[PDB]
Write a protein that binds this ligand. Structure first.
Ligand code: TRR
Length: 162
């Protein structure tokens, strides 16, 4: 399992799940990472996503209640089922596109964490769930500078150690 998300300096993800900040660069990064790999998106994500489903990619819509249904992404209401699905396709890695509730559910059993940090700050009604940084040790990171400081962002990857 892999964690793919973007956050500001303060620690907020956005509003209603949708990224309030328009960073075509960071957005490009998310899209590129989900190419040729299995990704899981929460129900809130299904509505927050810009356009689904993606081509040449495997998208999955995960919700707490089985009443909910999603188009373009496989709908799974079983936490165990999501793990098994990734297990079935060892060739393709599983990445959690969100949301935070989804992240929390699989946060404990994640080996790779991807985080995007923005120098600028944004305000919204949705904040990212707490993470244990000390438990995970950063393996590598990349820094990209945009025209505007707020726009400028960096990519950091953490791997769980035991
Ligand atoms: C491609 O656009 C979006 C992409 C994403 C996913 C996403 C973006 N950026 C990063 N760094 N990680 C992600 N998982 C979430 C969104 O909103 C929830 C988007 O629309 C604003």
């Amino acid at each position: 399992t892999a964690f793919l998300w973007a956050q500001d300096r303060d620690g907020l993800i956005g509003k209603d799940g949708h990224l309030p900040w328009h960073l075509p660069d960071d957005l490009h990064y998310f899209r590129a990472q989900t190419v040729g790999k299995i990704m899981v998106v929460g129900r809130r994500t299904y509505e927050s996503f810009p356009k689904r489903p993606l081509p040449e990619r495997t998208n999955v819509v995960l919700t707490h209640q089985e009443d909910y249904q999603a188009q373009g992404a496989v709908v799974v209401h079983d936490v165990a089922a999501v793990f098994a699905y990734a297990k079935q396709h060892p060739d393709q890695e599983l990445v959690i596109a969100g949301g935070a509730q989804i992240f929390t559910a699989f946060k404990d059993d994640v080996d790779t964490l991807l985080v995007t940090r923005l120098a600028g700050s944004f305000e919204g009604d949705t904040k990212m769930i707490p993470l244990n940084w000390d438990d995970f040790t950063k393996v590598s990171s990349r820094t990209v500078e945009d025209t505007n400081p707020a726009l400028t962002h960096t990519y950091e990857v953490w791997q769980k150690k035991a």
